[PDB]
Amino acid sequence: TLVHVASVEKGRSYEDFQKVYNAIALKLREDDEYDNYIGYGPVLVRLAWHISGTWDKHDNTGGSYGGTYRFKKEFNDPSNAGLQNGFKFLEPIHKEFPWISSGDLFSLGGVTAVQEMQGPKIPWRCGRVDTPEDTTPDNGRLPDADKDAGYVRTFFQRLNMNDREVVALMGAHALGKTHLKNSGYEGPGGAANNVFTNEFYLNLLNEDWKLEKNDANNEQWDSKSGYMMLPTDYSLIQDPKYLSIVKEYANDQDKFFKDFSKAFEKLLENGITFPKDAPSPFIFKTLEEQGL
C-alpha cells in the first residue's frame, strides 16, 4: 500500500515556517485590489482545499502531500479553474523560500489566509514531500456543485469527513465569490467576504432564497440581498442532520471556529503519516501578533 511519511525539510524549524507565513501574509496585505478588492485570501483557502480534496482513502492516492498541483494535468483540471491566480500569488513566496515543499507551501497558504482574515488559529504540520508527475491524480475527484445532500455526504466520506466536518468546512463559502467564467456560478455568499465569520450559516437560515437560473443556465439560489448559494450549499438546510448543525454554527461562531479549525487541519493532513517523533503542530502568530 502507498504510504506518505512526513519528512521535515532538512534543518528547518518553527521559526523558518513562520517566516514563510509572514511573507504570505505581507503579500496578502499588499495585493488588496485583486478580485474587485476581495484580496487573495479566499482563493488561497480554495487552493489549499483543492490540493487536499483529491485524496482517496481507499488507496491513499492524491491529497496534499505530493504537491502535484504544480503539474499540468492537475493545474488544468476544470474543477481548478481560477486557482492559477493563487499559484501565481505563491510563486514569489516559493522563490524567496525555495527550501519549502510545494504541498507545504500550498497548504500553508490556506492556513495563513484564514488567520489573516481574522479566523481561528489552524495548527499546521510540515513535511509534505514533492512527488513525481506520474503521481498526479486524474481529474474528476473534486465535487460537483449541482447536487444534493446525499451526494455531498457520499463525496466527503471519501475524505473521511463526517457530517459535522462537512458542515464546518462549508462555512468557508462565506469567503470570496463564485465567478461565472470559472465555475458557471456567479455571486458572493454574504457581505463580509474577506473576513472569516459564521455568516454563511446565518445567511442560509435568514435570507429569502429564490431558485433561479444564472447566465450560464445553471440553477443557484439567490437572495434579495444579492447573495447566492450553490445547490450543494443549500442542501445543508434541506437535510435534517445538516440543518441541525447549520443552526448550531449560526448561533455560535466560536463553536464554528473550533470545529472548522479541526476539520481544515484534518483535510490538509489526509493521507500523511506523521512519525511519532515528528514536531508537534505549529501555531503561527499573525502579523499583528508580531507587530509586523
Site for ligand Cc1ccc(N)nc1 in 180-209 (CB under 6 A): 188-189
Give the contact letters, 178-207, x = binds to ligand HEM (CB under 6 A), - = no. xx--xx-x----------------------
The single-letter code of the amino acid at 6 is A
Binding mask 67-106 for ligand HEM (x = CB under 6 A): ---------------x------------------------
Which partner, ligand Cc1ccc(N)nc1, ligand HEM, none, binds residue 282 by CB below 5 to 8 Å per kind?
A: none
Query: Minimal distance in Å, beta carbon 176 to ligand Cc1ccc(N)nc1?
Result: 5
Residues that bind ligand Cc1ccc(N)nc1 (rule: CB under 6 A) add up to a total of: 10
Burial, 265: exposed, middle or buried (Cβ in 10 Å; 0-12, 13-18, 19+)? middle
From the list ligand HEM, ligand Cc1ccc(N)nc1, none, partner contacted by residue 228 (C-beta under 5 to 8 A by kind): ligand Cc1ccc(N)nc1
Residue nearest to ligand HEM (CB): 176
Q: Select the binding partner of residue 28 from ligand Cc1ccc(N)nc1, ligand HEM, none (C-beta < 5 to 8 A, by kind).
A: none
Amino acid, res. 134: D
- Residue closer to ligand Cc1ccc(N)nc1, measured from CB, 200 or 282: 200
Q: Which of ligand HEM, ligand Cc1ccc(N)nc1, none does 189 bind, CB closer than 5 to 8 A by kind?
A: ligand Cc1ccc(N)nc1
The answer to the question of residue 178 lying near ligand Cc1ccc(N)nc1 (CB under 6 A) is yes
- Cell numbers 459535522 correspond to 164
Q: Which three cell numbers stand for residue 197?
A: 465569520
**Interacting residues with ligand Cc1ccc(N)nc1 (CB under 6 A):** 173, 176-178, 188-189, 228-230, 233
